[PDB]
Structure formats: structure tokens, C-alpha cells
Amino acid sequence: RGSLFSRIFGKKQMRILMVGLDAAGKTTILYKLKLGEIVTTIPTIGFNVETVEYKNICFTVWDVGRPLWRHYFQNTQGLIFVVDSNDRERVQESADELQKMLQEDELRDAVLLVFANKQDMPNAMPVSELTDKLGLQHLRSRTWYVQATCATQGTGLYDGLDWLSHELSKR
Numbered sequence: 001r002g003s004l005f006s007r008i009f010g011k012k013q014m015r016i017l018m019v020g021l022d023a024a025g026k027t028t029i030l031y032k033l034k035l036g037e038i039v040t041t042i043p044t045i046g047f048n049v050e051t052v053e054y055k056n057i058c059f060t061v062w063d064v065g066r067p068l069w070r071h072y073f074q075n076t077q078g079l080i081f082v083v084d085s086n087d088r089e090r091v092q093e094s095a096d097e098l099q100k101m102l103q104e105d106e107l108r109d110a111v112l113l114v115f116a117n118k119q120d121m122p123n124a125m126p127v128s129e130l131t132d133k134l135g136l137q138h139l140r141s142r143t144w145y146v147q148a149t150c151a152t153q154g155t156g157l158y159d160g161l162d163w164l165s166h167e168l169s170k171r
């Protein structure tokens, strides 16, 4: 009945937080999921949140780089971090914002999926290089994976979520 994405997580409640710098490709990704309408709410002044929710699946999105964050963090099961692989000037900023997330105690048990997006672009930073620059090899007791993606084509998004689904299958 729903999209291919609607079945990727089975029936159990799935709470995903997907963040990144502005223009990383997050809205594009939500739209490819085909899990229904992208709805924007402003639960506190200056804090725009996008949500796609389909039955047992809830994706919450905002830009990075607040007291309200904690309630999301506390039961977030998957953390998706989206990076514009072609924006070399902002990779350090992206990396710092990811590290800040990973340092939040309330996100301690989140499985981390990194979407290395805009891999279609000629000057995109290779996944190996990006993985190094985001500092992921220094992480201890975090389950993580970096997925090459082209959100505008859709490429990689199911691959990444399939991985995340397997990692969280016993949630």
C-alpha cells in the first residue's frame, strides 16, 4: 500500500532524527521517501522543524550550524547526518556539528547513518576522505556507516536506510 520505504522498518515504532547544514539535501531526501507530506512546524520561536510520519515511522528534520531538542533526543533510535560532499569549504563546519550531536548524552545509544550526499557532483569529496574529515574513525562504542548518495536521483537512500533498519531490527 505505501512506498518501498514504508516497509523497510517492519512494524515496530521507528524514530529517526535527520540533521545537517542547510542545503545538505535533507528536504530532497524526505521527498524521495514517498512516506507522505513534508510538514513544517515551529514548535518554538526561530526553530523550524520538518516531519514526515507514516504509521510507525517518524522522521524529524532540522538544520544545524535548545531545551526542545532533549525530548527528541531522548527517544531518537537512528541519527542521520547529511553532508554536502561537494561543499569542501563547509566540511569542517559539518564535522563540528556532527561531533556536537555525538557528544549529547541523550543521543548516546543512537545508531549513526551518514548520508554522504551530492556524490553525483564532479568535485565531490570521496567517501573515504569525508569519513576521515568527519572524524568517524576515532569514535568508540558508536555504531556507524557512511553511505554514498545522490538524493536528487534517490541513489543510496534505500541502501542506507536498509542498513539502519538491520542495525535497529531488535529495537
Ligand SMILES: Nc1nc2c(ncn2[C@@H]2O[C@H](COP(=O)(O)OP(=O)(O)O)[C@@H](O)[C@H]2O)c(=O)[nH]1
Residues within 6 Å of the ligand: 020, 021, 022, 023, 024, 025, 026, 027, 028, 029, 117, 118, 119, 120, 121, 149, 150, 151, 152, 153
Ligand atoms: N547535485 C546534487 N544536488 C542535490 C543533491 N541533493 C540535493 N541537492 C540540491 O541541493 C539543494 C539543497 O537541497 P535541500 O533538500 O533543500 O537541502 P536542505 O537545506 O538540507 O533541506 C537543492 O538545490 C537540491 O536539489 C544531490 O545528490 N546532488
Ligand SMILES: [Cl-]
Residues within 6 Å of the ligand: 003, 004, 005, 033, 034
Ligand atoms: Cl518508493
